[PDB]
């Protein structure tokens, strides 16, 4: 698991003034690596398909209530013509 | 005597029953729209 590197180590001392050819070192933490713990990404069990099932069941349940309300409100036009026509005839009797 | 007193009876029966005909429509058309409101309300519940 060691990355390949031909060269071991080299040395020409670090005078703060004489910095030339500005490269950048690999910045590392001071803590032992063992707690830089492992990669884990876990799925939500509710799947893109499962939410489809749940929301479709909800849509189909709501459609029944919408149809119930429509059929409750679809009888009012029958009520108007069932209630007012006899009243119009009674007025006509005069 | 019996002519004019019986002629107004038709109008009496007409008016005292037209007073009820509209009361029935007051009651019958309000106990029905409340069902529509309750149904809309239930549909709002489902969401």
From Swiss-Prot, chain A:
Region of interest (Interaction with major capsid protein/MCP), ranges: 1-49, 1-50
Compartments (UniProt record): Virion; Host nucleus
Origin: domain of life: Viruses
Oligomeric form and interacting partners: Heterodimerizes with CVC1. Interacts with major capsid protein/MCP and triplex capsid protein 1/TRX1 at the pentamer vertices. Interacts with the large tegument protein/LTP. Interacts with host NUP214; this interaction might be essential to the capsid docking to the host nuclear pore. Interacts with host TMEM250.
Family statement drawn from the similarity comment of this UniProt entry: Belongs to the herpesviridae CVC2 protein family.
Biological role: Capsid vertex-specific component that plays a role during viral DNA encapsidation, assuring correct genome cleavage and presumably stabilizing capsids that contain full-length viral genomes. Participates in the interaction between the capsid and the tegument through interaction with the large tegument protein/LTP. May mediate the capsid docking to the nuclear pore allowing entry of the viral genome into the host nucleus through binding to host nucleoporins NUP214.
Name of the protein in question: Capsid vertex component 2
Organism: Human herpesvirus 1 (strain 17) (HHV-1)
Included range, full protein: 1 to 94 of 580
From Swiss-Prot, chain B:
Subcellular location: Virion tegument; Host cytoplasm; Host nucleus
UniProt function note: Large tegument protein that plays multiple roles in the viral cycle. During viral entry, remains associated with the capsid while most of the tegument is detached and participates in the capsid transport toward the host nucleus. Plays a role in the routing of the capsid at the nuclear pore complex and subsequent uncoating. Within the host nucleus, acts as a deneddylase and promotes the degradation of nuclear CRLs (cullin-RING ubiquitin ligases) and thereby stabilizes nuclear CRL substrates, while cytoplasmic CRLs remain unaffected.
Post-translational modification note: Proteolytically processed, possibly into several polypeptides. Enzymatic activity is only detectable following cleavage of the UL36 protein, which occurs late during viral replication.
Residues included from the entire protein: 3117 to 3163 of 3164
Name recorded for this polypeptide: Large tegument protein deneddylase
Record note on quaternary structure: Interacts with host CUL1 and CUL4A; these interactions inhibit the E3 ligase activity of cullins. Interacts with inner tegument protein. Interacts with capsid vertex specific component CVC2. Interacts with the major capsid protein/MCP. Interacts with VP16; this interaction is important for outer tegument association to the capsid. May form homodimers.
Lineage, top ranks: Viruses, Duplodnaviria, Heunggongvirae, Peploviricota, Herviviricetes
Annotated family: Belongs to the herpesviridae large tegument protein family.
Domain of life: Viruses
């Amino acid at each position: 698991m060691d990355p390949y590197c031909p060269f071991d180590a080299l040395d020409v001392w670090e005078h703060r003034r004489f910095i030339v050819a500005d490269s950048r070192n690999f910045i590392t933490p001071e803590f032992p690596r063992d707690f830089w713990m492992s990669p884990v990404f876990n799925l939500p069990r509710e799947t893109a398909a499962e939410q489809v099932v749940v929301l479709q069941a909800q849509r189909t349940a709501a459609a029944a209530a919408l149809e119930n309300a429509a059929m409750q409100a679809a009888e009012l036009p029958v009520d108007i013509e069932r209630r007012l026509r006899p009243i119009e005839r009674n007025v006509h009797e005069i | 005597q019996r002519t004019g007193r019986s002629a107004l009876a038709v109008l009496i029966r007409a008016c005292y029953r037209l007073q009820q005909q509209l009361q029935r429509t007051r009651r019958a058309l309000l106990h029905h729209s409340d069902a529509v409101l309750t149904s809309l309300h239930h549909v709002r519940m489902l969401l």
